Design a binder for these strands. Structure first.
Ligand SMILES: Nc1ncnc2c1ncn2[C@@H]1O[C@H](COP(=O)(O)OP(=O)(O)OP(O)(O)=S)[C@@H](O)[C@H]1O
Ligand SMILES: Nc1ncnc2c1ncn2[C@@H]1O[C@H](COP(=O)(O)OP(=O)(O)OP(O)(O)=S)[C@@H](O)[C@H]1O
Ligand SMILES: Nc1nc2c(ncn2[C@@H]2O[C@H](COP(=O)(O)OP(=O)(O)O)[C@@H](O)[C@H]2O)c(=O)[nH]1
Ligand SMILES: [Mg+2]
Ligand SMILES: [Mg+2]
Lengths: 353, 330, 96, 332, 257, 258
DNA sequence: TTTTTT
DNA sequence: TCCGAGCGAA
DNA sequence: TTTGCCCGGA
């Protein structure tokens, strides 16, 4: 679409522009795709995993994979409650995010996916006999968000119907993927681009958009502030250009998102005042962040690594902080009410300082 | 059933048919048999661990009371049946308050696996049990008393089925050997009894597997080697070798020894942990802190193993736990 | 329930009482004898057997042409909120 | 042939094709003659041959034509609540066994019972498992149950007692190299000496993973189109193993002990996407088999690695857990 | 096949099955050369149904050797519904069978519909439960018994039958009150079907659960008269006569509290 | 510009109800020849095709072809609002954002006007080439529908097999199996009830029961149904109209065993 | 959707 | 167009 | 000492 992060997204394996060895591996997979195993792409956020999944699908099935439409599918729970799932589809593949339905994601696996596996499909645009002569492809986004029951429901579908269906699962971490599912997948590591690769991409955008640029070093700064997140770097470039009248300067500052600013303020507060009253104000800040769709795990990660950057703390404080972060990150994984665990972490940190 | 009883698993082929074939529960059997003899049958509760003879005993009692046609004269319900409040109020209450169809006599209701019933159904049962006592008697069977309400427990005469002692298992094994034309060495019998934890089902299943594992069961003899082979379990010698290496050798040699012993027969780590815990329980330790550290760390490792994890890291954890705990022994 | 309330007591909100009429028919100048005081006791006891009842009672408290007295034990309960602005609240405390 | 991923293409067809589970396969093979198959509980780690074994056994027992009428397979993809167990499973267990044809009776043992396979039974609720208990016993005459699981502690004790236990062992270079080499030869994959054993070492007990790794390596070699051998470095790259140089860098940063340096190095390291579990495994191997560290250090680090691996098993943030582990090692 | 039994019209068998469907779930049919007998017992084990169909109910019948077919009544009724009341219905079974074949064939066309219902391994004896000399034997039209039962069931969950010399008394006592119907024997040579017959040696007084009687009266669709046999120590027998055989309900009385 | 008046609105209502459960949004390509529509279902296991002819309409004219994208739910609601006895008229202009529906009754007193907003549906082009099917059969729709309803009660899948003078519908399930065997039969006195079969190769295929249940709803349109089956094609179910037809291309279930 | 009391 | 039931489901 | 969203219905 119109935003630069979308306008210039590559549409084929030939148009990819970072991590050349991974590109070669993907081309090798797409060379003879009839016995392609199920795939699991993993790597840090915003590096190009979905871009590469779409490029691989294009290499296998042609450009038609980018002609997408959305459709609403209905389901009913045992309690008779109605649920809807948005499904993205091309003529050659489906894309689902079962975690959209929360703990009911299992239903999506047990009914929708299974059905796709058991049926043949018609095709009156590529097949001479009206039937599609190819396996069906299903992309499962945010696969590490599936509950253990849904992941279990995948196991035998992947084996029994391998003739008719192939799965591509995408995740930012494999830690929550159960061992049987990883056993069934070809695991593809997708590393972040280097800062030079990011600078080259950003420079290409700067040229195609006629943005005035005092020095190339600016791009490097952006590349460094994005910590390998290419989506973040492209969006930051656009925002900086918009705020500097499409003319970036060496003095032009890096724009941080609102939630990051709030979290940094919270870090300064925790460091300055360790007391019960301060903890109550912190609870208010945490509720504000959570209510506006900042996930608890993101808050914990950002707060931990903001604290560890504070110059005034000593090694003992920092080691205590990282231990507490580990403990309460596990707590967040095992529990429901996030504010409880975030408050516990902040309280222990205040005690340690 | 289909074809002969020789097609059945040994755990079902050797199910007791009469009270005289129930072993290792003599006090209970005597009491209940004389209850029947004198015509004084109270409401019964059979409480005990798996495979100790509860269902066998109650079915044998019904067979003795009512003869061969018992199955049409009792109401038997278990966890495979719905037993909600509605079932209690309709099916159970109707059977309790009505005469027999086939032969005159009192009614028997058997609630097997009663720990599977909800609190509301159990409470509905209270006055059904009390009101129709003149003509009906209830028998409740359970592995877990805590899911039974205090009011239901009060109304039943309790009988605890013990883990089967050594002598009873030995006699049952002798019967099985005679019937199967099997031979069993003394050490093999000791190993079998040790691994069964007083559960007859385990004994019979292992024995059937051992017979299947022989080349010629007519001449071949089941030795402890066969038992360990079919169970995929560590020999006592392996356990002692591993423990000695952990307690007396350097880290490289202990790691090597654990890995080599495990690789020898593809032993599981949890089995080694169980065996070593059993061995260490008999140790005399100067410091209580040694026992504390050993137990807590090994329980943590067992719990982590139950969820999967990295086997190599868990083995190293076991080695380190034992060494660090015995450091306290000075 | 809303159905029973609408089919029953509703018709008495603006109706004379036949019992009241015939009790004090002989009595001269008895103005109140023919009118109702509607007492709805134990409002806090209206469970699932009275779906829609509390809202309908609040409606009546706004649209009644005869005096209505409601009684409850737990005034601060959430389900008693609809009555807030439409009733004259009289608190009874523990006597000494 | 050319349409199957290799894991499904080379699934064992009969009991003699299962490679390293003789202790259990022998017992099962004897029932082709004894015809008194017990209730079975297969348990073990992923990709060791449990599902393959039960399928091959049913084929050997009933032949291709009569199998379908003699089997009820229910797995984690199917609804298996207490109502299902009390109605569908019970009803199937109650039925008379399908009549075998004369040809079937000539060519197969045809035992007088049917089989219910509850694959992935450790995902069933405790109450549904309880509902199975008396169904298993009352209808043993005409039905035998096979429960399959990875976590045996998830099966309630009464059911474990009813079942005959078969533990499937981990598959490693010692006991699965023959099968892997057979597959490699069938597919014409050229490898240096050591490569197949390295694959099985990396797989860490899982033959499905080893076969998939072999297929990925052969795809790479065919795409390269140079006729060279697959190397161990290539296999390790495909398997997401951290290069030895990177691991040495981590070890030296830990040795230095400067918190900020470790933090910055870990932040850079995470950008490569290395799986934290593989990193922890490699650190365990490096430290526990190192003659330069003494007994107290190794005791402490063994507990540290155990704790971090356990926390990672719960689905935690890999960056946080890895940094905590490295800081703690550095302060030993 | 070994067993072949053809109903001229499937409606006969459907009505017979519907005559006792609501009381029991699992039914065991034994087919022999002289016809088909069946038994079933209700879930609470308080009611037993016994059916007899003779060879005369069938257009054609053949049973080379005795055979036992156990099945669930809901599945059987579901299948019976899939066929048309007008088609000819042939029950077919083979030796040592795993299923029963229901073959719906209409002569007008060449359309065959063959259903196979898998059978259960229901091993249970029938015991031929019937006491020799019942205390009281009575018979009356089915509509009147249905009416009495339906009226008295609105009052109580239990109904008492008292037989004394030349009098039959139904009684029900409940929360809102009680009801009592007394009938006397009577022969009407103009309309024998309305007759009420009563023979009795010992007077009887027995109580029964109302819901069971409400199920039992559903047999009235299969016969104009119902026979009732009662004894102090035995289940009560309610018999409805078919053109060829019979439908019997054996209902155990309540324990005298 | 474009106007199409039907002899009776009941025909149009029945046609719409025929395939409204399978698909909801559809484009009608009104042309001088007639109305032609083609839709794929969301799961892509089913294609519905409509070829209402000019003779079907009482009167019809549309000089320049026009594509009208509409949702079938709103059209069904509007048709329900109409009376049984009416001459439904569809009216549209050169560039219509909506279509006008006139329910002109026989009595001039009753006149009703409705407006249905159109839609812009991105529908691609489908090339449905004629194929030499392995077998063709024709039979009454009441019989086929009754077979489907009876067999669906036994299983989730129904198998259709054709061999030499034998058409077999089978369903296997938990409680058992059901099978119907029809044979080629001709009745001169009542030709409409005949069963016709052209057999080139033996065929066996399996279909989801829910899909056949959806399909049989078109039985009202035509007293007879044609079924064409091939080993590699979708199964073709045709209900003939006065001059057009309602057509269903159904994909079979994936044969895991073979 | 609800564990226990003395 | 206005109103808040009943549930915590991000 | 009782929140926020906002049902089904008018
Ligand atoms: N005391 C016993 N004497 C002889 N055989 C026994 C005995 N206990 C168990 N068994 C054997 O193990 C099998 C199971 O016995 P059961 O009586 O059904 O066990 P249980 O006590 O009911 O176990 P739970 O509580 O249902 S897990 C029997 O068929 C016998 O073969
Ligand atoms: N013992 C084995 N012998 C031969 N191949 C095996 C063996 N074990 C695993 N495999 C191979 O890996 C694939 C998976 O085997 P499975 O039997 O499905 O493993 P599994 O034990 O059922 O794994 P889980 O518990 O579902 S993760 C097989 O198709 C084989 O190709
Ligand atoms: N020029 C160029 N841009 C890329 C490449 N890979 C990713 N991007 C850009 O980075 C954006 C984020 O990529 P994405 O696949 O959504 O990240 P992920 O799925 O979270 O890993 C995309 O919208 C693209 O614009 C690449 O190889 N070349
Ligand atoms: Mg028992
Ligand atoms: Mg498996």
């Amino acid at each position: 679409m119109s935003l630069w992060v979308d306008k210039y997204r590559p549409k084929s394996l030939n148009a990819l522009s970072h991590n050349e060895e991974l590109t070669n591996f993907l081309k090798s997979l797409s060379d003879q795709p009839r016995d392609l195993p199920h795939l699991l792409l993993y790597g840090p956020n915003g590096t190009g995993k979905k871009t590469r999944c779409m490029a691989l699908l294009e290499s296998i099935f042609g450009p038609g994979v980018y002609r997408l439409k959305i459709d609403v599918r209905q389901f009913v729970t045992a309690s008779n409650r109605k649920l809807e799932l948005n499904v993205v589809s091309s003529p050659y593949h489906l894309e689902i995010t079962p975690s959209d339905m929360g703990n009911n994601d299992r239903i999506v696996i047990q009914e929708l996916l299974k059905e796709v596996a058991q049926m043949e499909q018609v095709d009156f645009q590529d097949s001479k006999d009206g039937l599609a002569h190819r396996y069906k492809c299903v992309i499962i986004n945010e696969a590490n968000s599936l509950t253990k029951d849904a992941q279990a429901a995948l196991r035998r579908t992947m084996e029994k119907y391998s003739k008719n269906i192939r799965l591509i699962m995408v995740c930012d971490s494999m830690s929550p993927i159960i061992a049987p599912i990883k056993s069934r997948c070809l695991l593809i590591r997708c590393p972040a681009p280097s800062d030079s690769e990011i600078s080259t991409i950003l420079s290409d955008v700067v040229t195609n958009e006629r943005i005035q640029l005092e020095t190339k070093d600016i791009l490097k700064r952006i590349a460094q502030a994005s910590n390998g997140n290419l989506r973040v770097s492209l969006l930051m470039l656009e925002s900086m250009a918009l705020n500097n009248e499409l003319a970036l300067k060496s003095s032009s500052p890096i724009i941080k998102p609102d939630w990051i600013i709030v979290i940094h303020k919270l870090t300064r507060k925790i460091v300055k005042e360790r007391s019960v009253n301060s903890l109550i104000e912190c609870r208010a800040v945490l509720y504000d962040l959570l209510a506006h769709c900042i996930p608890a795990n993101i808050i914990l990660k950002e707060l931990t690594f903001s604290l560890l950057d504070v110059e005034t703390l000593n090694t003992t404080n920092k080691s205590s902080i990282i231990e507490y972060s580990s403990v309460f990150d596990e707590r967040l994984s095992l529990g429901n009410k996030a504010i409880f665990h975030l408050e516990g972490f902040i309280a222990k940190v205040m005690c340690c300082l | 059933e289909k074809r002969s009883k020789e097609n059945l698993p040994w755990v079902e082929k050797y199910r007791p048919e009469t009270l005289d074939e129930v072993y290792g529960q003599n006090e209970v059997i005597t009491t209940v048999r004389k209850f029947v003899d004198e015509g004084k049958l109270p409401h019964l509760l059979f409480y005990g661990p798996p495979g100790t003879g509860k269902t066998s005993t109650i079915v044998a009692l019904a067979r003795e009371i009512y003869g061969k046609n018992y199955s049409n004269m009792v109401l038997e319900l278990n966890a495979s049946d719905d037993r909600g409040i509605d079932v209690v109020r309709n099916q159970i209450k109707d059977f309790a308050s009505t005469r027999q169809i086939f032969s005159k006599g009192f009614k028997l209701i058997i609630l097997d696996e009663a720990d599977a019933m909800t609190n509301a159904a159990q409470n509905a049962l209270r006055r059904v049990i009390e009101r129709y006592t003149k003509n009906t008697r209830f028998c409740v069977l359970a592995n877990y008393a805590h899911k039974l309400t205090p009011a239901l427990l009060s109304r039943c005469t309790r009988f605890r089925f013990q883990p089967l002692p050594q002598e009873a298992i030995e006699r049952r094994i002798a019967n099985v050997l005679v019937h199967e034309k099997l031979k069993l060495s003394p050490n093999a019998e000791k190993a079998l009894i040790e691994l069964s934890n007083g559960d007859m089902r385990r004994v019979l299943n292992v024995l059937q597997s051992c017979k299947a594992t022989l080349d010629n069961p007519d001449e071949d003899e089941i030795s402890d080697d066969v038992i360990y082979e079919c169970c995929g379990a560590p020999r006592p010698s392996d356990l002692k070798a591993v423990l000695k290496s952990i307690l007396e050798d350097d880290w490289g040699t202990a790691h090597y020894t654990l890995n080599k012993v495990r690789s020898a027969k593809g032993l599981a780590l949890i089995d080694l942990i169980e065996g070593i815990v059993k061995i260490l329980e008999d140790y005399e330790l100067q410091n209580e802190e040694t026992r504390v550290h050993l137990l807590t760390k090994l329980a943590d490792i067992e719990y982590s193993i139950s969820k999967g994890g990295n086997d190599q890291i868990q083995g190293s954890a076991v080695i380190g736990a034992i060494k660090a705990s015995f450091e306290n022994e000075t | 329930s809303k159905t029973l309330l609408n089919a029953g007591v509703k018709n008495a909100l603006d109706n004379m009482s036949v019992v009241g009429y015939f009790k004090h028919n002989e009595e001269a100048q008895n103005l109140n004898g023919k009118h109702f005081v509607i007492i709805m006791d134990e409002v806090d006891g209206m469970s699932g057997g009275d779906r829609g009842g509390v809202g309908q009672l609040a409606q009546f408290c706004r649209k009644t042409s005869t005096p209505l007295i409601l009684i409850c034990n737990e005034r601060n309960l959430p389900k008693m909120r609809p009555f807030d602005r439409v009733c004259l609240d009289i608190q009874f405390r523990r006597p000494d | 042939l050319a349409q199957q991923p290799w894991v499904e293409k080379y699934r064992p067809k009969n009991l003699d094709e299962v490679t390293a589970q003789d202790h259990a396969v022998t017992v099962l093979k004897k029932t082709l003659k004894s015809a008194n198959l017990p209730h079975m509980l297969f348990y073990g780690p992923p990709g060791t041959g449990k599902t393959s074994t039960i399928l091959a056994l049913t084929k050997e027992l009933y032949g291709p034509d009569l199998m379908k009428s003699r089997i009820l397979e229910l797995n984690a993809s199917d609804e298996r609540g207490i109502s299902i167990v009390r109605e569908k499973v019970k009803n199937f267990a109650r039925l008379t066994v399908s009549k075998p044809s004369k040809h079937d009776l000539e060519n197969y043992p045809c035992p007088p019972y049917k089989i219910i396979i509850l694959d992935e039974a450790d995902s069933m609720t405790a109450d549904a498992q309880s509902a199975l208990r008396r169904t298993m016993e009352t209808y043993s005459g005409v039905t035998r149950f096979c429960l399959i699981c990875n976590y045996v502690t998830r099966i309630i004790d009464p059911l474990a007692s009813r079942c005959s236990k078969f533990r499937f062992k981990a598959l490693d270079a010692s006991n699965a190299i023959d099968r892997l080499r057979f597959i490699s030869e069938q597919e014409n994959v050229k490898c240096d000496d050591g490569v197949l054993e390295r694959i099985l070492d990396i797989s860490a007990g899982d033959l499905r993973r080893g076969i998939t790794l072999l297929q990925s390596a052969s795809k790479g070699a065919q795409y390269l189109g140079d006729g060279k051998n697959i190397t161990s470095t290539q296999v390790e790259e495909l398997a997401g193993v951290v290069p030895h140089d990177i691991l040495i860098e981590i070890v030296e940063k830990v040795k230095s002990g400067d918190f900020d340096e470790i933090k910055k190095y870990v932040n850079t390291f995470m950008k490569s996407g290395w799986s934290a579990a593989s990193v922890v495994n490699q650190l365990h191997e490096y430290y526990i088999t190192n003659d330069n560290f003494d007994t107290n250090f190794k005791n402490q680090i063994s507990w540290l690695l155990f704790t971090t691996d356990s926390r990672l098993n719960n689905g935690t943030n890999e960056h946080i857990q890895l940094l905590n582990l490295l800081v703690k090692i550095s302060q030993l | 096949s070994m067993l072949e039994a053809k109903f001229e019209e499937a409606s006969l068998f459907k009505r017979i099955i519907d005559g006792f469907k609501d009381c029991v779930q699992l039914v065991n049919f034994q087919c022999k050369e002289d016809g088909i007998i069946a038994q079933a017992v209700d879930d609470s084990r308080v009611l037993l149904v016994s059916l007899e169909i003779g060879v005369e109910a069938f257009q054609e019948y053949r049973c080379d050797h005795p055979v036992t077919l156990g099945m669930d009544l809901t599945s059987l009724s579901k299948i019976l519904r899939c066929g048309n009341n007008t088609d000819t219905l042939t029950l077919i079974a083979d030796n040592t069978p795993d299923s029963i074949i229901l073959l719906f064939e209409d002569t007008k066309k060449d359309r065959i519909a063959e259903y196979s219902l898998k059978l259960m391994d229901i091993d249970a004896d029938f015991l031929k439960i019937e006491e020799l000399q019942y205390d009281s034997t009575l018979s009356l039209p089915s509509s009147e018994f249905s009416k009495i039962v339906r009226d008295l069931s609105q009052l109580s969950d239990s109904i008492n039958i008292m037989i004394t010399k030349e009098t039959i008394k139904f009684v029900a006592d409940g929360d809102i009150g009680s009801g009592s119907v007394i009938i006397k024997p009577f022969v009407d040579m103009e309309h024998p079907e309305t007759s009420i017959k009563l023979e009795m040696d010992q007077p009887v007084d027995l109580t029964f659960g109302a819901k069971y009687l409400l199920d039992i009266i559903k047999g009235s669709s299969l016969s104009d008269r119902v026979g009732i046999r009662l004894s102090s120590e035995a289940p009560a027998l309610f018999q409805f006569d078919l053109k060829s055989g019979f439908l019997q309900f054996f209902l155990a009385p309540k324990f005298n509290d």
